[PDB]
C-alpha cells in the first residue's frame, strides 16, 4: 500500500487500556483558558517519568456551548492506575486551574463513555474553609469556593472511562527537517479529532524507546537503536535519516483509529516522507492491535 | 508612600531558601524551544501539590549566545529539597526535553551562583544503550545520545544553587478585570528580569491561601478569607473587590527584589488599582525580609 | 430586556452592502498558514484609511477538508467598491501569500453566495514568465507557478458576493478593564460564527467615530464625543466609564445577526458591563436594520 | 569560504536608500501591544504591490524603558518615497493603533539617525474635535485625544531617517523543509538585531523575483527562474531543491550588515543547507553593495 507514493508498512500499533478523565476549562477569554490549560497539562508526556499523560483535546469550545457561557478548552488526563489518575486530577486542577486567573473546571466526559466518577470538586471545595457553597449551573452540581479573586467554580464530580493509550505511528523521512514538517502536519490533523490527544511535546516523540536495555540491567527502557539513524546497526530503509513517532491516547479505540488515519494521511502530503510504520510489542503486552492497512 | 496614586503598604514579603537549577534549552527554532519549555515547566506552580516550582526566566536567547548557535530559552526549576530537585531535573529533562523535537539542554547556572552540581546529562546518557558518546561543545562536556530523530545533546552536569523562593506582593483592585490587567502588566515586567521567574499560571495566583484551616483539621492550607472579597467578614480596604498575588522565585535576593520593584511599578500604572501589599509571618519563619518601601 | 442583568437597549444596528471575497489559505502547518493570513489581513480595519476590510473567518480548517490535504485557515476581504476589491485580492494574495513559505490560495466562496468572480489566479500566473502550468486539483482549476521555493498553487478564479458590512454593537462598562474583558469574550464568540469577521485590531474598536467634525471642515470622521468618558458633556449613562465598539462584516445578514447574538451574549457574562447599544443613522442610509431585541 | 561546511558565495547584496520611521507602541499588556503591531505592520512586505515595507524591530520593550511605564514593542515602517512614508505613518497609526485597545504610539527614532520629522500625532490630534489636549510625558510632547475607551496618547512628531532597504541573502538547501528550517533560524537571529527588520511573511520570501519578464512586455518583474528548482533551465547548484530569500531593511548599513551576519551564521547551523548566496543588480541600481565575505 502507498499513500501519495509513501509506503504504508503492513503492521500494527499495539495500544493499552488506561484510565481517562476529560475536563472543560473555561475562563474570561480563550487566552486565559489556554494559560490554565498549558499549566495543567504540562509535565505529562509519559507515565514512565511523568506523573500523568495529559494534553489538549478540543482547542476551542465556543462560549454558547459551555455551562457558563465563557470561552473554553477541553483537556484529557490519563494514567494506567485509577487512583493515580484521581490524585492527578486533584493536584492538576487544584494547583494549576484553581490558581489560574478566572479559570473554572467542569466535567466533559461523554455519558456514553462514563464508567466511574470521582468527586474532585467536592474534595477541593474544602479549600473554602466553610465558606464554600453548593450550587447548580446549567443542570450541573457545582461548588463556589471563595478565593481572593472572587469565586472559583468547579463541578462536584468528574467522569472516568477506560480509554486507549499508546496508539502510534512512525514517520520515516529523508532528513530531520522533512520528518518534522511531516510530523507537525500530522499533529495539526489530530487536533481536529474529538476525544484524542497527543501527550508528547508538540504531539511528537523525538526519542522513541524500546523495552529494556541490551547493555544495562538497571535500565527498564532505552533508545530504540533499531530506528536510530546514527547507530550503524539500525534496521532502517535506505535513505531514511530521521524517524519520529506520534503517540495518541483517546476516549475509545474508534477515536484513536480516526486520529491515526488523519495523522497518516496528512503526513503523507508533506515532502521527503519515505515510509510510515508503527510500534508494537509482538502482540504480547497491550489490549489493542491497530493495523495500519485496516485504517484505510 | 504612593506610586501613581496607589498606596504601597509599609510591610515586607517574607521569602525562603530553596534549591534551584537553571537550564538553557535550544532547538531548531524559537517555536520549538518554547514547545519543549512549556512541557518541561508545566505542573509546576507550587511544591505544595506539584512536583516542583518551575518557570521561564529568559524568553529569548539569541543564537549567537548559545553553545550550539541555535535559538534558546532559559528556564528555572526549584524545590526546597535538594534531592527532589535532582530527581525533577532528571524527569523533566528526560521526559519533556529529550523527547521534544530538536531540543538540546545545557547548564545555565552562573558560575558565581553555583554551590553544587549533579551529572544529569551523565545519568541520561545511559539511554543510549552503549551507543552514547562524550563530546565537547563550546568547551562544555556533553553527551550525544543517539535517538530516532538523530542525536540528543545534553550537558554532562548542571549547577545547583540556594536561591530565594516566595518573594511576593498583593494587588488590591476595584474589580477583577482591573486587578487582572494590572497583574499581567506586572508579569510582563518581571519577564525582563534575569534570574527571576513567576511559577504560577501566567505568573499570577488567583487563589492565595493561608496556613491551615479554621474548620478542617485535615487541610495544610485553605483560602485566605481575610482577602476574599465574597467573604462577609474579610479585611479588605473600602473599594477593593479583587485581590491577586504575584509570587516570585529567583537565583538570589537581588533578582527577587528587582522583579518585585518592576512588577509593582508596572501594576501601579494600570487603572483601578487601590493598594499594594505583601505577605509575611512576622519575620519569624523565612530567611529573607524584603521591605516594599526599600524597593523604591 | 436584560441579559445577566445587563440592559439591552431597544435599538438597531444599521448595516450596508459591500463586496466580499473569501479565501482559503493552506500551508505546511497551521503555523505557516497563520503567518500568511496575518500578513494578508493586516492594514485592513476600515475602508476609510485602509485599502480594505479583512479578517479571519475560520481559524482552523482540517487538512481533510482542504483541496490539497494540508491545514488551512479561511479569511475574508471586503470593500464597498468591487473594482477596489479585485485589486486588493490581487495585491494581498500576490505580495502576502505567494511570498509566504509553503502557502497556497484557494477559493472558499460558497456556491450559493457567489454572484461574480475574478480570475485572480490567472492574472498572478504570468509571474511564472511562461513556465506557469495549468492543473486540476480536487476538481479545481489551479495554476502551478514556479518559484524559488518550488511551486505556488493558486485557484484560477475567486467568487465574489454582496455581503453585509458594519453590523455593530457597543459595550458600555464601568471601567476600561471591565470593558476590554467583556469585548474580548465577545470576539472569542464571534470567532466561532462561519462567514463573519471582525476587521478591527483584536476585533475591537477603541476609537469609535462620528461622521464629520464639529470644529473642522477638513475631517470626514472624528471622535464620537457623545460616548467619550472624558468629554465633560458626554451622553453616557451614569456609571459608564468606557465604551468599546464591535464591528462585524459577513457573507449575508444571517451570519452578521448570529455574530451579534453570540457576541452580545458572551459580553454580558463578564463583570462590570452596564448596557449594550448599537449605532444607526435613523434607518435612512443603510440596507439592513438589525434590532437587538429581535436577536434574542 | 565555508561556515559549518556551508559554501558562502563571494558575491554581494545590492541594497537601496529608503525613508524609514521607527515607532514604539505601548499597551496595557504585551498581548495588546502585539495586536496593534500585527495590524499596523501587515500588508507591508514590498512597496511593489504593498503600500509600505513594515515589520517588528524589538519584540519586547520593558515597561521601565517606555515613556508611560507599560509593555512595548518597536516597529519600523519604510518607503522609497518620503511623502508616501508620511501618509503610511498617518494611516497605519490612525487606523491600526489609535483604534487598537489601550495602544499608544511614541517616536523611537534614535537622535543620531534623525534627519527629518513629521508631526503625525499633531495631525491625528484633530480627531479630538477640539477636545484634544497637548501634554508632556517623560519630556515628550504628546497629544491626549479623547476616545470612547478613554484616551489615546500619541507623540506630536516622529523622526525620519534614510535607512537601507533590500539587504538580503539566499539560502540554498537540499529540500523545501530543510530550507525552511534554516530560514526560520535565520530570522530568529535577526530578531535580536536592533534597528533591522524583515518585512516578508515570517521574515521569508518564497517567491524571489527578477526585474522584468522574458515573455511579457507588461510585467515589471517575474519569478527568478534562474533559481527556480522546477524550471528546467535553472542555474542552481547540484543538489539544490529549494531556495529561500531573506530580505532585511534597517536604520543604517551597519544594522543591515549585522542582521545578514547573524542570520547567515544561524542558517548555517541547520541541516541540509548547501550554499549561501545573495541577490544583486550588477552594481547598477542601488546605493549599497554588501559583500558576504566581508561580514565574516
Coordinates of N, CA and C in Angstrom, one line a residue, chain A residues 13-182:
Chain A
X13 N 0.1 -0.9 15.4 CA 0.4 -0.3 16.6 C -0.3 -1.1 17.7
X14 N 0.4 -1.3 18.8 CA -0.1 -2.0 19.9 C -0.4 -1.1 21.1
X15 N -1.7 -0.9 21.4 CA -2.2 0.0 22.4 C -2.5 -0.7 23.7
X16 N -2.9 0.1 24.7 CA -3.1 -0.4 26.0 C -4.3 0.3 26.6
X17 N -5.0 -0.4 27.6 CA -6.0 0.2 28.4 C -5.4 1.2 29.3
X18 N -6.1 2.3 29.6 CA -5.7 3.3 30.5 C -6.9 4.1 31.0
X19 N -6.9 4.5 32.3 CA -8.0 5.3 32.8 C -7.9 6.8 32.3
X20 N -9.0 7.4 32.1 CA -9.0 8.7 31.5 C -10.1 9.6 32.0
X21 N -9.8 10.9 32.2 CA -10.8 11.9 32.5 C -10.7 13.0 31.4
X22 N -11.8 13.7 31.3 CA -11.9 14.8 30.3 C -12.5 16.0 30.9
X23 N -11.8 17.1 30.9 CA -12.2 18.3 31.6 C -12.3 19.5 30.7
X24 N -13.4 20.3 30.9 CA -13.7 21.5 30.2 C -13.2 22.7 31.1
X25 N -12.2 23.4 30.6 CA -11.7 24.6 31.3 C -12.2 25.8 30.7
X26 N -13.0 26.6 31.4 CA -13.4 27.9 30.9 C -12.7 29.1 31.6
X27 N -12.7 30.2 31.0 CA -12.0 31.4 31.6 C -12.6 32.7 31.0
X28 N -12.1 33.8 31.4 CA -12.6 35.1 30.9 C -12.5 35.3 29.4
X29 N -11.4 34.7 28.9 CA -11.1 34.7 27.5 C -10.5 33.3 27.1
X30 N -10.3 33.1 25.8 CA -9.7 32.0 25.3 C -8.2 32.0 25.7
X31 N -7.6 33.2 25.7 CA -6.2 33.4 26.2 C -6.0 32.8 27.6
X32 N -6.8 33.3 28.6 CA -6.7 32.8 29.9 C -7.0 31.3 30.1
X33 N -8.0 30.8 29.3 CA -8.2 29.4 29.3 C -7.0 28.6 28.9
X34 N -6.3 29.1 27.9 CA -5.1 28.4 27.4 C -3.9 28.5 28.5
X35 N -3.8 29.6 29.2 CA -2.8 29.7 30.3 C -3.0 28.6 31.3
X36 N -4.3 28.4 31.7 CA -4.6 27.4 32.7 C -4.3 26.0 32.1
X37 N -4.7 25.8 30.8 CA -4.6 24.5 30.2 C -3.1 24.1 30.0
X38 N -2.2 25.0 29.6 CA -0.8 24.7 29.4 C -0.2 24.3 30.7
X39 N -0.6 25.0 31.8 CA 0.0 24.6 33.1 C -0.5 23.2 33.6
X40 N -1.8 23.0 33.4 CA -2.5 21.8 33.9 C -2.0 20.5 33.1
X41 N -1.6 20.7 31.9 CA -1.3 19.5 31.0 C 0.2 19.3 30.8
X42 N 1.0 20.2 31.3 CA 2.5 20.1 31.2 C 3.0 19.0 32.1
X43 N 4.3 18.7 32.0 CA 5.0 17.6 32.7 C 4.1 16.4 32.7
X44 N 3.6 16.0 31.4 CA 2.7 15.0 31.2 C 2.8 14.3 29.9
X45 N 4.0 13.9 29.5 CA 4.2 13.2 28.2 C 4.0 11.7 28.4
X46 N 4.5 11.1 29.5 CA 4.6 9.7 29.7 C 4.5 9.3 31.1
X47 N 3.8 8.3 31.5 CA 3.7 7.9 32.9 C 5.0 7.2 33.4
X48 N 6.0 7.1 32.6 CA 7.3 6.5 33.0 C 8.1 7.3 33.9
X49 N 8.3 8.6 33.5 CA 8.9 9.6 34.4 C 8.1 10.8 34.7
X50 N 6.9 10.9 34.1 CA 6.0 12.0 34.4 C 4.8 11.4 35.2
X51 N 4.1 12.3 36.0 CA 3.1 11.9 36.9 C 1.8 11.5 36.2
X52 N 1.6 11.9 34.9 CA 0.4 11.6 34.1 C 0.7 11.7 32.6
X53 N -0.3 11.3 31.8 CA -0.3 11.6 30.4 C -1.5 12.6 30.1
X54 N -1.2 13.8 29.8 CA -2.2 14.9 29.6 C -2.0 15.6 28.3
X55 N -3.1 16.3 27.8 CA -3.0 17.1 26.6 C -4.3 17.7 26.2
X56 N -4.3 18.6 25.3 CA -5.5 19.3 24.8 C -6.2 18.4 23.8
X57 N -7.5 18.3 24.0 CA -8.4 17.6 23.0 C -8.9 18.7 22.0
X58 N -9.9 19.4 22.5 CA -10.5 20.5 21.7 C -10.0 21.8 22.1
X59 N -9.2 22.5 21.2 CA -8.6 23.7 21.5 C -9.5 24.9 21.6
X60 N -10.7 24.8 21.1 CA -11.6 25.9 21.2 C -13.1 25.4 21.3
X61 N -13.7 25.8 22.4 CA -15.1 25.4 22.6 C -15.8 26.8 22.7
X62 N -16.8 27.0 21.8 CA -17.5 28.3 21.8 C -18.2 28.6 23.1
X63 N -18.3 29.9 23.5 CA -19.0 30.2 24.8 C -20.4 29.7 24.9
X64 N -21.1 29.6 23.8 CA -22.5 29.2 23.9 C -22.7 27.7 24.1
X65 N -21.6 27.0 24.0 CA -21.6 25.5 24.3 C -21.0 25.2 25.7
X66 N -20.6 26.1 26.5 CA -20.2 25.9 27.8 C -21.3 26.1 28.9
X67 N -21.1 25.6 30.1 CA -22.1 25.7 31.1 C -22.3 27.2 31.6
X68 N -21.2 28.0 31.4 CA -21.2 29.3 32.0 C -21.1 30.4 30.9
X69 N -21.2 30.0 29.7 CA -21.2 31.0 28.6 C -19.9 31.7 28.4
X70 N -18.8 31.1 28.8 CA -17.5 31.7 28.6 C -16.6 30.8 27.7
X71 N -15.6 31.4 27.0 CA -14.8 30.6 26.1 C -14.1 29.4 26.8
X72 N -14.0 28.3 26.2 CA -13.4 27.1 26.8 C -12.4 26.3 26.0
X73 N -11.8 25.3 26.6 CA -10.8 24.4 26.0 C -11.1 23.0 26.8
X74 N -11.0 21.9 26.0 CA -11.1 20.6 26.7 C -9.8 19.9 26.7
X75 N -9.4 19.4 27.8 CA -8.2 18.6 28.0 C -8.5 17.2 28.5
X76 N -7.6 16.3 28.3 CA -7.7 14.9 28.8 C -6.5 14.5 29.7
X77 N -6.8 13.8 30.8 CA -5.8 13.4 31.6 C -5.8 11.8 31.8
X78 N -4.7 11.2 31.6 CA -4.7 9.7 31.6 C -3.6 9.1 32.5
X79 N -3.9 7.9 33.0 CA -3.0 7.1 33.8 C -3.5 5.7 33.8
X80 N -2.6 4.7 33.8 CA -2.9 3.3 33.8 C -3.5 2.9 35.2
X81 N -3.2 3.6 36.2 CA -3.7 3.4 37.6 C -4.8 4.4 37.9
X82 N -6.0 3.9 38.3 CA -7.1 4.7 38.5 C -7.0 5.6 39.8
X83 N -6.3 5.2 40.8 CA -6.0 6.0 41.9 C -5.0 7.1 41.7
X84 N -4.0 6.7 40.9 CA -3.0 7.7 40.4 C -3.7 8.8 39.6
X85 N -4.7 8.4 38.8 CA -5.5 9.4 38.0 C -6.3 10.4 38.9
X86 N -7.0 9.8 39.9 CA -7.8 10.7 40.8 C -6.9 11.7 41.5
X87 N -5.7 11.2 41.9 CA -4.7 12.1 42.5 C -4.3 13.2 41.6
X88 N -3.9 12.8 40.4 CA -3.5 13.8 39.3 C -4.6 14.8 39.0
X89 N -5.9 14.4 38.9 CA -7.0 15.3 38.7 C -7.0 16.3 39.9
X90 N -6.9 15.9 41.1 CA -6.9 16.7 42.3 C -5.8 17.7 42.3
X91 N -4.6 17.3 42.0 CA -3.4 18.1 42.0 C -3.3 19.1 40.9
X92 N -3.7 18.6 39.7 CA -3.6 19.5 38.5 C -4.7 20.5 38.5
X93 N -5.9 20.1 38.8 CA -7.0 21.1 38.9 C -6.8 22.1 40.1
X94 N -6.5 21.5 41.3 CA -6.3 22.3 42.5 C -5.1 23.3 42.4
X95 N -4.0 22.9 41.8 CA -2.9 23.8 41.8 C -2.5 24.5 40.4
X96 N -3.2 24.1 39.4 CA -3.0 24.7 38.1 C -4.2 25.3 37.4
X97 N -5.4 25.0 37.9 CA -6.6 25.6 37.4 C -7.3 26.5 38.4
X98 N -7.5 26.0 39.7 CA -8.0 26.8 40.8 C -7.1 28.1 41.0
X99 N -5.8 28.0 40.7 CA -4.9 29.1 40.9 C -4.8 30.1 39.7
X100 N -5.3 29.6 38.6 CA -5.2 30.4 37.3 C -6.3 31.4 37.2
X101 N -5.9 32.7 36.8 CA -6.9 33.8 36.7 C -8.2 33.5 36.0
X102 N -9.3 33.6 36.7 CA -10.7 33.4 36.1 C -11.1 32.0 35.7
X103 N -10.2 31.0 35.8 CA -10.5 29.7 35.3 C -11.5 28.9 36.1
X104 N -12.4 28.2 35.5 CA -13.3 27.3 36.1 C -13.1 25.9 35.5
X105 N -13.6 24.9 36.2 CA -13.4 23.5 35.7 C -14.7 22.7 35.8
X106 N -15.0 22.0 34.7 CA -16.3 21.3 34.6 C -15.9 19.9 34.0
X107 N -16.8 18.9 34.2 CA -16.7 17.6 33.6 C -17.1 17.7 32.1
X108 N -16.3 17.0 31.3 CA -16.6 16.9 29.8 C -16.5 15.4 29.4
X109 N -16.7 14.5 30.3 CA -16.7 13.1 29.9 C -18.1 12.8 29.3
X110 N -18.2 12.3 28.1 CA -19.4 11.8 27.5 C -20.1 10.8 28.3
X111 N -21.4 10.9 28.5 CA -22.2 10.0 29.3 C -22.0 8.6 28.8
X112 N -22.0 8.4 27.5 CA -21.8 7.1 26.9 C -20.5 6.4 27.2
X113 N -19.5 7.3 27.6 CA -18.2 6.8 28.0 C -18.0 6.5 29.4
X114 N -18.8 7.2 30.2 CA -18.6 7.3 31.7 C -18.8 5.9 32.4
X115 N -17.8 5.4 33.0 CA -17.8 4.2 33.8 C -17.8 4.5 35.3
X116 N -16.8 5.3 35.7 CA -16.7 5.6 37.2 C -16.8 7.2 37.3
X117 N -16.7 7.6 38.5 CA -16.6 9.1 38.7 C -16.0 9.4 40.1
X118 N -15.3 10.5 40.1 CA -14.6 11.0 41.3 C -15.1 12.4 41.7
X119 N -15.4 12.6 42.9 CA -15.9 13.9 43.3 C -14.7 14.9 43.6
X120 N -14.0 15.2 42.6 CA -12.8 16.1 42.7 C -13.2 17.5 43.2
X121 N -14.3 18.0 42.7 CA -14.8 19.3 43.0 C -15.3 19.4 44.5
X122 N -15.9 18.3 44.9 CA -16.3 18.2 46.3 C -15.0 18.2 47.2
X123 N -14.0 17.5 46.8 CA -12.7 17.5 47.6 C -12.0 18.9 47.7
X124 N -11.9 19.6 46.5 CA -11.4 20.9 46.5 C -12.2 21.9 47.3
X125 N -13.5 21.6 47.4 CA -14.4 22.6 48.0 C -14.1 22.9 49.4
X126 N -13.4 22.0 50.1 CA -13.0 22.2 51.5 C -11.9 23.3 51.6
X127 N -11.3 23.7 50.5 CA -10.4 24.9 50.5 C -11.1 26.2 50.9
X128 N -12.5 26.1 50.8 CA -13.3 27.3 51.1 C -13.3 27.6 52.6
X129 N -12.9 26.6 53.4 CA -12.9 26.7 54.8 C -14.2 27.0 55.4
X130 N -15.2 26.3 54.9 CA -16.6 26.5 55.5 C -17.4 27.6 54.7
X131 N -16.7 28.3 53.8 CA -17.4 29.4 53.1 C -17.8 28.9 51.7
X132 N -17.3 27.7 51.3 CA -17.7 27.1 50.0 C -19.2 26.9 50.0
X133 N -19.8 26.9 48.8 CA -21.2 26.9 48.7 C -21.6 26.1 47.5
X134 N -22.5 25.1 47.7 CA -23.0 24.3 46.6 C -24.0 25.1 45.7
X135 N -24.0 24.8 44.4 CA -24.9 25.5 43.5 C -25.2 24.6 42.3
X136 N -26.1 25.1 41.4 CA -26.4 24.4 40.2 C -26.2 25.4 39.1
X137 N -25.6 24.8 38.0 CA -25.2 25.7 36.9 C -25.4 24.9 35.6
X138 N -26.4 25.2 34.8 CA -26.8 24.5 33.6 C -27.1 23.1 33.9
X139 N -27.8 22.8 35.0 CA -28.1 21.4 35.4 C -27.0 20.7 36.2
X140 N -25.8 21.4 36.2 CA -24.7 20.8 36.9 C -24.6 21.1 38.4
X141 N -24.2 20.2 39.2 CA -23.9 20.4 40.6 C -22.4 21.0 40.7
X142 N -22.3 22.2 41.1 CA -21.1 22.9 41.3 C -20.8 23.4 42.7
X143 N -19.5 23.7 43.0 CA -19.1 24.3 44.2 C -18.6 25.7 43.9
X144 N -19.0 26.7 44.7 CA -18.5 28.0 44.6 C -17.6 28.3 45.8
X145 N -16.3 28.3 45.5 CA -15.2 28.4 46.5 C -14.7 29.8 46.5
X146 N -14.9 30.6 47.6 CA -14.3 31.9 47.7 C -12.8 31.9 47.6
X147 N -12.3 32.7 46.7 CA -10.9 32.9 46.5 C -10.6 34.4 46.5
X148 N -9.4 34.8 46.6 CA -9.0 36.3 46.7 C -9.5 37.0 45.4
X149 N -9.6 36.4 44.3 CA -10.0 37.0 43.0 C -11.5 37.1 43.0
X150 N -12.2 36.4 43.8 CA -13.7 36.2 43.7 C -14.1 34.8 44.1
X151 N -14.6 34.1 43.1 CA -15.0 32.7 43.3 C -14.4 31.8 42.2
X152 N -14.0 30.6 42.7 CA -13.6 29.5 41.7 C -14.8 28.6 41.6
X153 N -15.2 28.3 40.4 CA -16.3 27.3 40.2 C -15.8 26.0 39.7
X154 N -16.2 24.9 40.3 CA -15.8 23.6 39.9 C -16.9 22.6 40.0
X155 N -17.0 21.7 39.0 CA -18.1 20.7 39.1 C -17.8 19.7 40.2
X156 N -18.8 19.3 40.9 CA -18.7 18.3 42.0 C -17.9 17.1 41.6
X157 N -18.3 16.4 40.5 CA -17.6 15.2 40.1 C -17.2 15.2 38.7
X158 N -16.2 14.3 38.4 CA -15.7 14.2 37.0 C -15.7 12.7 36.6
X159 N -16.3 12.4 35.5 CA -16.4 11.1 35.0 C -15.0 10.4 34.6
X160 N -15.0 9.1 34.7 CA -13.8 8.4 34.3 C -14.1 7.2 33.4
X161 N -13.4 7.0 32.4 CA -13.6 5.9 31.5 C -12.3 5.1 31.3
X162 N -12.4 3.9 30.8 CA -11.2 3.2 30.3 C -11.0 3.5 28.8
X163 N -10.0 4.3 28.5 CA -9.7 4.6 27.2 C -8.5 3.8 26.6
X164 N -8.0 4.3 25.4 CA -7.0 3.6 24.7 C -5.8 4.5 24.7
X165 N -4.7 4.0 25.2 CA -3.4 4.7 25.2 C -2.3 4.0 24.4
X166 N -1.5 4.8 23.7 CA -0.4 4.2 23.1 C -0.6 3.9 21.6
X167 N -1.7 4.3 21.1 CA -1.9 4.3 19.6 C -0.7 5.1 19.0
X168 N -0.2 4.7 17.9 CA 1.0 5.3 17.4 C 1.3 5.0 15.9
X169 N 2.1 5.9 15.3 CA 2.8 5.5 14.0 C 4.2 6.2 14.0
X170 N 5.0 5.6 13.1 CA 6.4 6.2 12.9 C 6.4 6.8 11.5
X171 N 6.9 8.0 11.5 CA 7.2 8.7 10.2 C 8.7 8.5 9.9
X172 N 9.0 7.9 8.7 CA 10.3 7.7 8.3 C 10.6 8.7 7.1
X173 N 11.6 9.5 7.3 CA 11.8 10.6 6.3 C 13.3 10.7 5.9
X174 N 13.5 11.4 4.8 CA 14.9 11.6 4.3 C 15.8 12.5 5.1
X175 N 15.2 13.2 6.0 CA 16.0 14.2 6.8 C 15.2 14.5 8.0
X176 N 15.8 15.2 9.0 CA 15.1 15.7 10.2 C 14.1 16.8 9.9
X177 N 14.5 17.8 9.1 CA 13.6 18.8 8.7 C 12.3 18.3 8.0
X178 N 12.6 17.3 7.1 CA 11.5 16.7 6.3 C 10.5 15.9 7.3
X179 N 11.1 15.2 8.2 CA 10.4 14.4 9.1 C 9.5 15.3 10.1
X180 N 10.1 16.4 10.5 CA 9.4 17.3 11.4 C 8.3 18.1 10.8
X181 N 8.5 18.5 9.5 CA 7.4 19.2 8.8 C 6.2 18.2 8.6
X182 N 6.5 16.9 8.3 CA 5.5 15.9 8.1 C 4.8 15.6 9.5

